[PDB]
Design an enzyme around this catalytic site. Structure first.
Site, PDB file in Angstrom:
ATOM      1  N   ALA A   1       0.830  -1.203   0.000  1.00 19.95           N
ATOM      2  CA  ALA A   1       0.000   0.000   0.000  1.00 19.95           C
ATOM      3  C   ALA A   1       0.860   1.247   0.000  1.00 19.95           C
ATOM      4  O   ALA A   1       1.907   1.211   0.628  1.00 19.95           O
ATOM      5  CB  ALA A   1      -0.972   0.025   1.207  1.00 19.95           C
ATOM      6  N   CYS A   2       0.453   2.348  -0.686  1.00 22.45           N
ATOM      7  CA  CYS A   2       1.277   3.565  -0.688  1.00 22.45           C
ATOM      8  C   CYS A   2       0.479   4.771  -1.164  1.00 22.45           C
ATOM      9  O   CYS A   2      -0.626   4.579  -1.648  1.00 22.45           O
ATOM     10  CB  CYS A   2       2.523   3.354  -1.594  1.00 22.45           C
ATOM     11  SG  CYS A   2       3.957   4.370  -1.114  1.00 22.45           S
ATOM     12  N   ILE A   3       1.038   6.003  -1.030  1.00 18.94           N
ATOM     13  CA  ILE A   3       0.328   7.242  -1.366  1.00 18.94           C
ATOM     14  C   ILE A   3      -0.781   7.082  -2.391  1.00 18.94           C
ATOM     15  O   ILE A   3      -1.932   7.313  -2.048  1.00 18.94           O
ATOM     16  CB  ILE A   3       1.254   8.469  -1.686  1.00 18.94           C
ATOM     17  CG1 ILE A   3       2.100   8.406  -3.001  1.00 18.94           C
ATOM     18  CG2 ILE A   3       2.168   8.846  -0.482  1.00 18.94           C
ATOM     19  CD1 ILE A   3       3.020   7.164  -3.163  1.00 18.94           C
TER      20      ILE A   3
END
Length: 78
Positions: free
Chosen positions: A20-22
């Site tokens: 998961a990320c920005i």
């Protein structure tokens, strides 16, 4: 389906690996027997790629549009 589509793969917390990320998520697993990535890519994220060994998801570009659909789900299932 949209409030259960994101669930179909991102809600499979059982998943072995997830990046998961920005505005970028990923879902490296073998629960592809019947996964709805084809929906989770244009409906959960904004473009994913499948590579036997791992899977990558990208909610860029139309992030606000897809995230808006996400917002709808919790509001539809709150």
């Amino acid at each position: 389906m949209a409030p259960a589509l994101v669930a179909a793969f991102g809600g499979k917390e059982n998943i072995t690996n997830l990046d998961a990320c920005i505005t970028r998520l990923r879902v490296s697993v073998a629960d592809v027997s019947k996964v709805d990535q084809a929906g989770l890519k244009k409906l959960g994220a904004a473009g994913v790629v499948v590579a036997g060994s791992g899977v990558q998801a990208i909610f860029g570009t139309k992030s606000d549009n897809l995230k808006t659909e996400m917002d709808e789900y919790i509001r539809n299932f709150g």
